[PDB]
Structures are given as C-alpha cells and as structure tokens.
Amino acid sequence: MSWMQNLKNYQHLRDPSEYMSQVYGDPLAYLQETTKFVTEREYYEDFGYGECFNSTESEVQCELITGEFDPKLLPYDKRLAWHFKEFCYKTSAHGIPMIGEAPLEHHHHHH
C-alpha cells in the first residue's frame, strides 16, 4: 500500500519490510527480490515476484487493486521502474514473463 510508495520514494538501503508484505506469493522470493535489486537472471527467471508469474496464488493477493505501487512517488529510474512494473504491474497473471522466465511451480500455501 501507500507505505511501499513512502519507502520507494527514498530507497536508502535494502529494507525488506514492505517487500515481505508486498509478496503476493512465496516470501522467500521477495527476499531474493529486495536483496538483489533488479540484478539477476534467477531474480526475474526462477524465484521472485508472486502470482503475477508463478502458477499459484498465496496468502497475500496481487496488490494491483487493494493497494498502490505505481511509479507515482518513485524517482524516475527507467531500469528500476520497468522491473517493478514487470513483477507488480503485470496484466497477465500466472504465467508469461517479460525479461526473464516464469516457472509454473505449483504451491498450495493453505486450503
């Protein structure tokens, strides 16, 4: 939500707090996310993002509707904005990548 916008307005270090609450999939993935910072194949090919790429939906649902992550308070860095768009601002959910790949891994967090 708005706090993700608040922090991204000044990405100082690598604070995973909002990223671990932003993860609409497996938290381990967004750990890789916040740690690497748009710099790795496995990052955007094997483990990152959430339901926007993987073949499942988890405890947290895609923030697209219920929150705010668009480049509004985010300083203009095209490479960064592009990736954050790729993972978060994704139209085709569950499948279809942009730069890297999308593993169709089945993961049932809860019934």
Swiss-Prot record:
Functional note: Subunit of an amiloride-sensitive cation channel (degenerin channel complex) permeable for sodium, potassium, lithium and N-methylglucamine, and required for mechanosensory transduction (touch sensitivity). Negatively regulates the turning step of male mating behavior.
Coiled-coil portions: none
Tissues where the protein occurs: Expressed in AVM, ALM, PVM and PLM touch neurons.
Name used for this protein in its record: Degenerin mec-4
Name of the coding gene: mec-4
Compartments (UniProt record): Membrane; Cell projection, Axon
Topological domain ranges for the Cytoplasmic compartment: 1-103
Family: Belongs to the amiloride-sensitive sodium channel (TC 1.A.6) family.
